[PDB]
């Protein structure tokens, strides 16, 4: 408005002063934050997300309660490196059988070990161990291998797959399977050698990565413990740094391509960093706000938002081609789009904050702060453009393509001419999207406790494939893991979406085991829990309470509940009082617990969560039946993973609803005349769901990362649609028909093209830079981009649908 125009004139008058007032702020923020704390440093690679679903609290509580109270025959602790049935390892095994190349590679690794990660021992052996008894020789003839294979097969009696005297060799085989009957060949070689013994330090790990690159007979996979976590940290460091740098480069390239701005555009990128600085600053005061993925989404979001802003500025410059006053008016029009984008981002933050996840919450905060930062950036960017106008050059690229804009215009025209046809195509795509959500199915599960895939690093990727080949070689060192207990210490988690330990010592509502009431209550618990857990199988059937009453009735003694509890605690004859129990030791008190095995533990939570839910209901009914109904947290280790998945699903849904709120807020910010962009926003959301489904087409499993990506994507898509939205809004009054839609699409097409290029660049740079560390994020970004472009072409058909029939 007038005052807004006045601020614009204030900026125009301060084409340099205004810019300084922001660039300096960025610098100061960078310094203060750097000095105050080392925010860029990340404590851990793991997300550690807290589900917060009435069960996550119980789990955290159980955790807290428990916490309250010949030569070189290296063991498993020594970092093992096994390569089996691989093209690289295959060459090694074939040459080992012929020229003994594998043995030489192992020796070379030992030589590298002497330098670092080396009393020091030469090397553990799997294949060299067999012939080692006869003699240690790098020659490695075939006759020795044949004899070794014969003894390996002779060891079928002890383990089906002399021979007993080679006990150490037998252990070697245990470590290296599928090399006896199959033989020492390219087929499942399973190196399994220990170059370093008991070495989880980071420096040996770094050397291990290079060693894994066959820099020191080709070895495919190697492993390291403890050192693996350090490697993952290094992965987050180097890989994310590279992808981010590439992102900045692409953004700069795009800026020059669109606006041919060599300093102001660069200043926009620097402004993105400034924004990150502001976010970091404000967040630090309110909380730690640290998460690796938070940084990843931060860089991605910044790239996209800044891209949008630059797109806005460029659109204004194109419309420009008093002049400063009209420039200001264009600044206002674009400011609307900037505001729309910011709205999308902020609501995205709201989505990630609704579901409290140690990871999702941080991403949300970074997004929100960076978003408001992007708004101030929308201002500064405008100032940057103003300065560009104030000065061209030091004191030159024509940047013009023949009929390119016209070519896009014609593309918009063709899309518009077949308004009915394109509309049908989009609707069909929407139907296909919903179908995908149905079939194969929206819900997905992770294949393990930590994550379905938890190795983004290449060397770590080899280590993961090694983990699988190890599962083949060595048995995974699953069974049921339920454990009902006495109570809950703190149902409320660490205050406000904060990853922390709310309490250290347990707590429970003061309840006493009334001799007649409690014993029978525990007995009933044992009976029903027997019907659910025992399942006619032998596994921790005895209950710390019923067994106690039994031992007491057998001992016949020496207010029965208190005395009996005291006697049992004093005695604890069987299984040391069932291992952990009576955690209420601060004062003489009796606590209860029970490790059960009702159902098998499954990595996937499709049914594992079904079982946890069934058990949850059974426990709920049991608690209902109990007369004192004293709260007891019946948590299970598996219940935690199931909850993580449940929370991920809850977050996705809450995010979608939040997206509904985003669309509503957008139209509320962009719809005062007759009609509303809600129809369009809904179409966009459908496109977002379509993108999610497309990710499924990419087989991206449903995981925390997948969730965060779905959120950021909802944002990117909303911004894409925002342009067309504001346009249709403005054009309806002017022509109210396919003609208005044509012109609106004409102006929109430019924005669409720019945003498309921006997203494509960010996604491409990020996905290739990291081999699965953040590749899922880049792929998701690309998916969002594709769905966005599709939705872009369909955006205008939406307007057509808005036109009266």
Numbering used by the authors: 11 to 79, 150 to 198, 205 to 247, 282 to 336, 342 to 446, 453 to 526, 561 to 642, 646 to 726, ...
What does the paper say about this structure?
Dispatched (Disp) is a 12-transmembrane protein that plays a critical role in the Hedgehog (Hh) signaling pathway by releasing the dually lipidated ligand HhN from the membrane, a prerequisite step to the downstream signaling cascade. Structural studies have revealed common features of RND transporters. In this study, we report the characterization, expression, purification, and cryo-EM structure determination of Disp from Hypsibius dujardini, a type of water bear.
The ones with higher yields were then combined. This yielded the construct (dubbed wbDisp*) that consists of residues (1–111, 123–530, 542–1116). To determine its 3D structure, wbDisp* purified in digitonin was subjected to cryo-EM analysis. A 6.5-Å map was reconstructed using 62,850 particles, showing a slingshot shape with the two extracellular blobs as the branches and the transmembrane helices as the handle. To obtain a model at this low resolution, the recently published structure of the fruit fly homolog (ffDisp) was trimmed to poly-alanine and fit into the map, followed by manual mutation and adjustments. WBDisp showed a monomeric structure with 12 transmembrane helices. The two slingshot braches create a wide opening with a gap of ∼21 Å at the bottom and of ∼32 Å at the top, enough to accommodate an HhN molecule which has a dimension of ∼20 × 30 × 38 Å. The water bear Disp (wbDisp) has an overall similar structure with ffDisp and hDisp, despite that they only share modest sequence homology. Specifically, the inner leaflet part of TMH1, TMH3, and TMH6 shift towards TMH2, compressing the membrane core region, and this is repeated for the TMH1’, TMH3’, TMH6’, and TMH2’ in the C-terminal pseudosymmetrical half.
